[PDB]
Design an enzyme around this catalytic site. Sequence first.
Site, PDB file in Angstrom:
ATOM      1  N   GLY B  94      -2.232   0.421  13.650  1.00  0.00           N
ATOM      2  CA  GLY B  94      -0.953   0.114  13.143  1.00  0.00           C
ATOM      3  C   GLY B  94      -1.370  -0.825  11.652  1.00  0.00           C
ATOM      4  CE  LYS B  97      -7.844   4.429  10.643  1.00  0.00           C
ATOM      5  NZ  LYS B  97      -8.489   3.764  11.849  1.00  0.00           N
TER       6      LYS B  97
HETATM    7  N1  LIG Z   1       1.572  -0.135   1.532  1.00  0.00           N
HETATM    8  C1  LIG Z   1       2.523   0.611   2.288  1.00  0.00           C
HETATM    9  N2  LIG Z   1       3.587   1.395   1.901  1.00  0.00           N
HETATM   10  C2  LIG Z   1       4.485   2.012   2.561  1.00  0.00           C
HETATM   11  N3  LIG Z   1       4.187   1.913   4.008  1.00  0.00           N
HETATM   12  C3  LIG Z   1       3.235   1.531   4.417  1.00  0.00           C
HETATM   13  C4  LIG Z   1       2.324   0.793   3.666  1.00  0.00           C
HETATM   14  N4  LIG Z   1       1.227   0.386   4.574  1.00  0.00           N
HETATM   15  C5  LIG Z   1       1.550   0.761   5.833  1.00  0.00           C
HETATM   16  N5  LIG Z   1       2.713   1.403   5.772  1.00  0.00           N
HETATM   17  C6  LIG Z   1       3.550   1.795   6.900  1.00  0.00           C
HETATM   18  O1  LIG Z   1       2.711   1.720   8.137  1.00  0.00           O
HETATM   19  C7  LIG Z   1       2.657   2.558   9.110  1.00  0.00           C
HETATM   20  C8  LIG Z   1       1.202   2.984   9.685  1.00  0.00           C
HETATM   21  O2  LIG Z   1       1.312   4.191  10.451  1.00  0.00           O
HETATM   22  P1  LIG Z   1       0.096   4.457  11.428  1.00  0.00           P
HETATM   23  O3  LIG Z   1      -0.425   5.861  11.462  1.00  0.00           O
HETATM   24  O4  LIG Z   1       0.296   3.788  12.722  1.00  0.00           O
HETATM   25  O5  LIG Z   1      -1.225   3.439  10.737  1.00  0.00           O
HETATM   26  P2  LIG Z   1      -2.486   3.574  11.146  1.00  0.00           P
HETATM   27  O6  LIG Z   1      -3.201   4.643  10.099  1.00  0.00           O
HETATM   28  O7  LIG Z   1      -3.259   2.209  11.044  1.00  0.00           O
HETATM   29  O8  LIG Z   1      -2.649   4.124  12.678  1.00  0.00           O
HETATM   30  C9  LIG Z   1       3.333   3.852   8.480  1.00  0.00           C
HETATM   31  O9  LIG Z   1       4.385   4.679   8.769  1.00  0.00           O
HETATM   32  C10 LIG Z   1       3.515   3.227   6.859  1.00  0.00           C
HETATM   33  O10 LIG Z   1       4.698   3.904   6.370  1.00  0.00           O
END
Ligand SMILES: Nc1ncnc2c1ncn2[C@@H]1O[C@H](COP(=O)(O)OP(=O)(O)O)[C@@H](O)[C@H]1O
Lengths: 431, 359, 441
Positions: B94, B97
Amino acid sequence: MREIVHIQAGQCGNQIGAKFWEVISDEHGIDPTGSYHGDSDLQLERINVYYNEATGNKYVPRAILVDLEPGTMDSVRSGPFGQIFRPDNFVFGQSGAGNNWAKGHYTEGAELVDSVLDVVRKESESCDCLQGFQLTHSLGGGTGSGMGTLLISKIREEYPDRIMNTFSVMPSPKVSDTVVEPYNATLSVHQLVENTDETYCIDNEALYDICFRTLKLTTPTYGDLNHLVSATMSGVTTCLRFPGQLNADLRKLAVNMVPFPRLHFFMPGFAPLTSRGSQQYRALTVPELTQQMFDSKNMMAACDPRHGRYLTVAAIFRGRMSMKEVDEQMLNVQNKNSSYFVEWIPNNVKTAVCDIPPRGLKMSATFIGNSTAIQELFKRISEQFTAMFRRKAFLHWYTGEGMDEMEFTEAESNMNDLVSEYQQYQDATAD
Amino acid sequence: SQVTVAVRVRPFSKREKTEKASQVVFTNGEEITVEHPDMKQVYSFIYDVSFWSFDECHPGYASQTTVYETLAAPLLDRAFEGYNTCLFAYGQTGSGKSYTMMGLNEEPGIIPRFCEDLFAQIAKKQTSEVSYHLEMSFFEVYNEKIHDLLVCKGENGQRKQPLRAREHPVSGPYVEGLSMNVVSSYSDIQSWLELGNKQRATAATGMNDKSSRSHSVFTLVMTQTKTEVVEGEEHDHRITSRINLVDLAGSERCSTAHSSGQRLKEGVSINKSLLTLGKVISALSEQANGKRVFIPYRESTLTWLLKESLGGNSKTAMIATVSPAASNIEETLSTLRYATQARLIVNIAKVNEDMNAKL
Amino acid sequence: MRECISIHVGQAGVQIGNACWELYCLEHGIQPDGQMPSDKTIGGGDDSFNTFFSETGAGKHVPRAVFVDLEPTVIDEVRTGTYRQLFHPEQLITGKEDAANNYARGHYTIGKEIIDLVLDRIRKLADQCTGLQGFLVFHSFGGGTGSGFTSLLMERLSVDYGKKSKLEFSIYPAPQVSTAVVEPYNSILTTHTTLEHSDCAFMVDNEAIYDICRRNLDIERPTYTNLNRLISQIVSSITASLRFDGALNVDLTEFQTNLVPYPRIHFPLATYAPVISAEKAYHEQLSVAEITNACFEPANQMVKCDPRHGKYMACCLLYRGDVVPKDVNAAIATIKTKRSIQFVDWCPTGFKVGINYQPPTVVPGGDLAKVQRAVCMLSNTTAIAEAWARLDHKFDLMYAKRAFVHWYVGEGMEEGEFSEAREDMAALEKDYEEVGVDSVE
Ligand SMILES: Nc1ncnc2c1ncn2[C@@H]1O[C@H](COP(=O)(O)OP(=O)(O)O)[C@@H](O)[C@H]1O
Ligand SMILES: CC(=O)O[C@H]1C(=O)[C@@]2(C)[C@H]([C@H](OC(=O)c3ccccc3)[C@]3(O)C[C@H](OC(=O)[C@H](O)[C@@H](NC(=O)c4ccccc4)c4ccccc4)C(C)=C1C3(C)C)[C@]1(OC(C)=O)CO[C@@H]1C[C@@H]2O
Ligand SMILES: Nc1nc2c(ncn2[C@@H]2O[C@H](COP(=O)(O)OP(=O)(O)OP(=O)(O)O)[C@@H](O)[C@H]2O)c(=O)[nH]1
Ligand SMILES: Nc1nc2c(ncn2[C@@H]2O[C@H](COP(=O)(O)OP(=O)(O)O)[C@@H](O)[C@H]2O)c(=O)[nH]1
Ligand SMILES: [Mg+2]
């Protein structure tokens, strides 16, 4: 209840086993038949830590004997106390190793190991709980090294949460009883430091000097040395076997004595060792034992610790004593000899006490140390190793059973890296 | 001979903003400050680099292209110099990454800019005299067992093939029997990564239905064949180079979520690997300070398979994806406290002895 | 009626209980088989005082205490010792394995599966009391059991019972002496959790009792029992206000109300002045002035901490025997008149007195001596921060290399917990440094 398994390999491990059981049977009150002749009810409350039970109260032991040549087994069976071991555990084969590590790890040992695993699972599952296993082998021959290390690897792959404590007769500097000691020992160390929780190194020249100077013997045969090793085995695990004031266990030792997982090669020692005509002229008290323990000519490591620093220490006492003297004397050791200890740990010592001493002594003590000096052993073997590998002296007896020149180099590089790891915490660096 | 640690503070999600949880992660420019909502204790953090993505209008914005031009391009430039390079990644599920490394189709991350600049500089520097070759491997680590993510297993169930680590004497360590496929265009890379991630080990615990329980290494290896003798066709000096990008799992603490099973046995090894990796990074940072120190590499698998890519004349980097909210504060500081490992100039003493520069 | 549940965790607590219940059963005329020849002689009376014991129909009495170690080398002694017919058989030998001196075994891998039995038995003990509650947890630092299991039990009892006074008669590590080398980490991770759930945790240190027992009792080769009987006398001097009668009573709530000004500084020290042997029992008057000047005297404190490096935030004083309160007034006036005994500007009152009517008893085979009056002091200072600082130094010298951590993550912990506990520990060391400041307009 805590329970232990004794695996017992080679022409060195089996004699040690005979003596070890000849000692523990006398501490728990057992005869060569199996019966009980004790004097105190504490003497069978925790007999299950090493033994099992039977029908007519015969108290059979837990032991797994993994030789490849039947000579040592047929010498043990027709012996003093070789009538109790479960004859489904006298495992053997034929076509002995011949002081070859390849004939105990790769080709022949695999034609025997599965039976040993079937025995180990039997002796384990019939325990209520488990604390760890044991393994007495040598390093310098084939069976004890190869078969023992393969069993170590497979058992740790099976039951990894449990402990695996190996008491090893490592080679000596001067008089080797075999020509291919360095190769076998190095290829074993490549498989012991990775897959073991605590290993207590032992050497024979230190035992010879300990039997000549202290005890002032004239004809020391191996019975007396194995008698010493058994006396150490026995006081390493009293905390599970009898009451106490500050109890302990093998996991406490493997935890407090092992800062990082690799550096678990320990120097053992036992006290009070005195001559048979000179116990008249001594005082069985705590500070004399503490003096005799940290002394260098009592340690079985073939290695003056005064060449290096102590990282961590475990002193297991036995006898009706006082804890103030223990703490005070260990403080004075930590203080008066600071240059022989490490500074990034403030307290390089712990303790343990059982209030039920051995059969004929008021009090006794056992010592375990993790030093930087033990590298002098490995630093020797590697210097013995490469001179033979640079010209490939005895190689073909190891390549004719399924090897290459690469694994030897892996083992050498690992041992040298461990030497450097020990050296990192030796030189007196001030911030 | 560096660590080059970095962070990235994402902006709020949509669910969080509708639910309207609190902003707590702030910035004093480069230095970061965070303020527990109980008004009780403040915590400070410094890094060589700090990326802000919370609100657009703030200066020092950290876009994806900023991330590339600030972190990644030096690794490529040093790969072309004939050395090797590694890059890390940390973040609990979350913390934004996968959006950072891989990106999305319309919003790229770090990987595609890296690979596309790779192809561009290939088609630029290449000549009729010189060439470039490029191979890929992609594997994973689960309970300290190596597994290959670039294969399909039999119609049987879990018969994953565990491979073995082996130390070459010269070329350095390697994995035995690993697939080393060839690539020339990004359409191949995306295909290979898509075969990969679908085979990676995932489970469902109290945080989310989809989490990561295994480390994942993506290795490229590049070869300069600038080997052309004046007398004729004869080869003098190839140059090999090892580029590495790894996605690591989170150090889940086993208290709020009782594990009671195999998940615990995964978590423990994951924790161990992360601890050893931070320990290695601190030692390399100290080595960069001219102080000779030991570099424990055999204490874990992910390091032992990456020895030659984090030592000598190599180059490294780290990035830490954290969260801005308060409902993910407890898992947030654990990231930042895991990424303090630069320790560049912090209260170093001084003793010196040097004389007799004369007769 | 009143009642106080006494819990013991680990070797330290179990041995302290072996001493404490000897003293308790000696005081109420109880016999080791639970029975009472006294009520056989009388036929009535509340002499079977029920603040600690519970009655049945067979003239038998049971203690309102359980003890657990996860180490059955100990409890089997009780089950086959002198006091097997007394205790309920529900003593938790669940110790199929030991706690290995790692908080993580005591707090998660072996902590879990052994606490629900303890909770059920505590609930069965509490449902047999229509009155007060107080959890006197005799536990230890350093070890993994007394750290882990203690932190989990107090954490769960904060939920299941809430507004009930929970106390701890701990064993603080010596700064020089120890018997373990993963000792400090466990102490820090214990304090980090039990700074909230506890209400007042007392502290002792065995180095102090060693020095006290050689200097005054004049015995040079002591065991741990001769250290534990002194703590048993401390506990009896505390709880006699509820068990027996007197002129001013100090229940369990009054300690947590009169010595815990701020919640995060609920870590006092303790002492017991008359520790003289039968030889020194003569040649000495043993008035209240000598005692009240001896309780504040270093080298008779039960922790190695010079109070003169700091100030006294509060003080409770619990007497036993023939005491005239006038002498107490004179003594406290004398202590305030001196200048080497400082006090905060915000606590001129300072003292909480409690007076009982019974003297102590004398354990046979002991070292202490028959006297006509006895005292306990419980002080809340700004001095022990120094002691904690030493711990929060040692930790660092061990933590910067990640020593002894693989054994901790090997049973489910995270690295950050160490950092979180050290950071939390720093927040306390400033509080002990903040209140010592004298206010200014
Ligand atoms: N810099 C950013 N710009 C746009 N969206 C972001 C950014 N950082 C995080 N997000 C959002 O956060 C969410 C993370 O999704 P997720 O796959 O759960 O992340 P992780 O890789 O931590 O599991 C995405 O839907 C993304 O759109
Ligand atoms: C004064 C007295 O009590 O007699 C002692 C004695 O004089 C000495 C010489 C004993 C004696 O030990 C030896 O003979 C010996 C000589 C060389 C090498 C090894 C042993 C003794 O035999 C040994 C024996 O000690 C024991 O039996 C222990 O229980 C020992 N077990 C055995 O020796 C044993 C018994 C039967 C079969 C096999 C072994 C032991 C140690 C650890 C844990 C459990 C048991 C005892 C009391 C003595 C004699 C008899 C002289 C000592 O024994 C040990 C190992 O501590 C050597 O120093 C100690 C104490 C004394 O100095
Ligand atoms: N005062 C006092 N302290 C004791 C006594 N017994 C043990 N200790 C202290 O306890 C510390 C070690 O105890 P622990 O490590 O907790 O042993 P334990 O209570 O069985 O807990 P675990 O070993 O984790 O299972 C030592 O530093 C001792 O000082 C005792 O009888 N009296
Ligand atoms: N301490 C001790 N060492 C022994 C004994 N018997 C043999 N050894 C050692 O064992 C080594 C020989 O190895 P060996 O047992 O033959 O290996 P194996 O052939 O594989 O069983 C030599 O270094 C000996 O010193 C003994 O009774 N006691
Ligand atoms: Mg214990």
